[PDB]
Amino acid sequence: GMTEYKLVVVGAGDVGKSALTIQLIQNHFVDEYDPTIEDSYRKQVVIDGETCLLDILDTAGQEEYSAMRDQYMRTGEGFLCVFAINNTKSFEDIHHYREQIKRVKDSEDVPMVLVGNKCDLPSRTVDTKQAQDLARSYGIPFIETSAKTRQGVDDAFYTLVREIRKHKEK
Amino acid sequence: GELPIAMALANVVPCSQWDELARVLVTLFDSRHLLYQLLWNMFSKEVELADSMQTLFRGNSLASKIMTFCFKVYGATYLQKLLDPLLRIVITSSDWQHVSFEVDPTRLEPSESLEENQRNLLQMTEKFFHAIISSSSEFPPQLRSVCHCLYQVVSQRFPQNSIGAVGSAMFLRFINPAIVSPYEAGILDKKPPPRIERGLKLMSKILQSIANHVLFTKEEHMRPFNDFVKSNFDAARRFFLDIAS
Ligand SMILES: Nc1nc2c(ncn2[C@@H]2O[C@H](COP(=O)(O)OP(=O)(O)NP(=O)(O)O)[C@@H](O)[C@H]2O)c(=O)[nH]1
Ligand SMILES: [Cl-]
Numbered sequence: 001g002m003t004e005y006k007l008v009v010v011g012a013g014d015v016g017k018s019a020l021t022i023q024l025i026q027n028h029f030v031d032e033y034d035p036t037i038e039d040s041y042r043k044q045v046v047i048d049g050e051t052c053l054l055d056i057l058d059t060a061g062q063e064e065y066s067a068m069r070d071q072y073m074r075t076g077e078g079f080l081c082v083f084a085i086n087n088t089k090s091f092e093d094i095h096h097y098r099e100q101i102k103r104v105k106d107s108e109d110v111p112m113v114l115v116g117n118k119c120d121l122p123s124r125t126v127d128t129k130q131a132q133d134l135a136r137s138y139g140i141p142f143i144e145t146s147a148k149t150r151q152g153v154d155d156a157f158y159t160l161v162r163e164i165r166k167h168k169e170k
Numbered sequence: 171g172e173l174p175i176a177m178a179l180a181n182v183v184p185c186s187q188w189d190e191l192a193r194v195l196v197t198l199f200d201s202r203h204l205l206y207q208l209l210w211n212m213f214s215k216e217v218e219l220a221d222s223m224q225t226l227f228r229g230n231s232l233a234s235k236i237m238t239f240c241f242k243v244y245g246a247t248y249l250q251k252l253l254d255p256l257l258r259i260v261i262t263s264s265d266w267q268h269v270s271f272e273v274d275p276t277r278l279e280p281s282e283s284l285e286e287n288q289r290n291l292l293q294m295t296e297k298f299f300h301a302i303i304s305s306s307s308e309f310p311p312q313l314r315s316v317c318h319c320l321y322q323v324v325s326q327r328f329p330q331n332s333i334g335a336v337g338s339a340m341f342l343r344f345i346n347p348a349i350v351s352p353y354e355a356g357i358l359d360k361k362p363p364p365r366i367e368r369g370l371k372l373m374s375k376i377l378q379s380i381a382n383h384v385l386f387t388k389e390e391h392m393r394p395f396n397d398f399v400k401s402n403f404d405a406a407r408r409f410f411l412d413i414a415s
């Protein structure tokens with residue numbers, strides 16, 4: 001049959017949360033101005049030979065909408081924490097997302113995956129080693145992606161599903 | 171004098187501190203009655219650099235941070251007076267048939283009717299939209315100058331997108347955050363009930379679609395509102411033109 005996974009994509013504005021999601025859901029890349037308030041998707045995929053149903057919440061990076069984080073952090077079971085490799089502030093924001101998720105769930109064991117997006121660009125301000133050290137500190141996977149070329153997109157979502165499943169099978 | 175000093179020092183503040191930088195810049199220059207000049211310079215710096223409207227105000231944008239600060243400090247009285255009567259009507263409505271806004275079929279209770287909830291959501295969105303575009307006489311004058319300054323700067327380089335830029339900014343960074351979270355915005359004294367919060371969030375998505383001139387193409391369950399969206403593009407532009415010209 002089929003297990004349901006509640007994924008939530010979080011991160012600063014314009015890091016590519018929606019572009020990553022739309023590659024997975026609609027198999028194209030759009031370069032348009034369309035800031036998210038909150039979008040919801042569902043998709044059935046096969047991960048490790050098991051059919052899975054993905055419930056994907058694509059959240060607002062614009063800080064004016066920060067009041068709705070508490071709700072979606074309560075309902076999500078795993079979090080794709082996305083920064084852009086050319087935006088130092090978005091990298092630093094990862095710590096704030098992680099600490100709010102840990103408070104709201106009252107846990108230090110929350111499934112999450114660190115995603116460094118826009119790796120197709122030669123404009124990099126966050127070194128891969130810096131991101132690997134942060135992920136290693138948190139004990140979570142780190143994946144470099146490009147929503148524009150689709151590099152790493154499926155692996156980012158599938159890795160989060162596998163972290164959630166590991167957590168549910170404890 | 172004061173402007174080149176402020177422009178040079180703004181480069182030194184890391185983007186993580188830009189909320190505080192925007193507060194201090196606006197506060198400093200407003201107290202010197204030089205706020206228009208600050209905005210003209212800050213907006214022109216970014217507008218002159220962009221090659222397209224799609225690449226303007228993206229990512230870390232000090233101009234955007236300044237604009238959202240101006241909306242918050244100069245627009246609080248207007249926002250509260252505009253939204254409070256509307257929110258009190260929807261919060262105190264006794265129709266339990268007209269009490270659900272769930273329009274995602276995958277979240278819909280079997281008791282409820284999708285087409286009824288869609289109509290319920292559209293009727294609320296119409297009341298809010300109509301009130302907003304009827305409110306120009308009440309717009310705060312200093313906020314009118316913020317929007318005019320953005321409109322004038324963008325128009326020197328992107329004349330065909332200058333009114334959309336004002337419209338998107340005003341909904342994205344001012345009106346819609348308050349509709350989605352009216353309690354945290356200080357308009358209501360109590361968080362609204364969850365069925366109401368659901369409707370407020372969905373309505374704000376429709377209002378933003380109108381303000382941005384984009385149709386729904388992402389979430390499947392939002393596309394049924396595209397005809398309502400298209401039918402309100404022109405009234406939205408006329409309102410933005412009134413505020414920004
Ligand atoms: N070069 C490049 N551009 C990308 C990539 N991903 C997204 N972008 C671009 O970056 C911008 C922001 O993308 P978007 O997906 O809207 O980011 P967001 O995090 O969802 N924004 P928000 O929080 O406001 O909803 C768009 O112009 C998009 O085309 C990527 O991998 N490479
Ligand atoms: Cl040009």
Ligand SMILES: [Cl-]
Pocket residue numbers: 327328329330331
């Ligand atoms: Cl133009």
Ligand SMILES: [Mg+2]
Pocket residue numbers: 017018019034035036058059060061
């Ligand atoms: Mg988005």
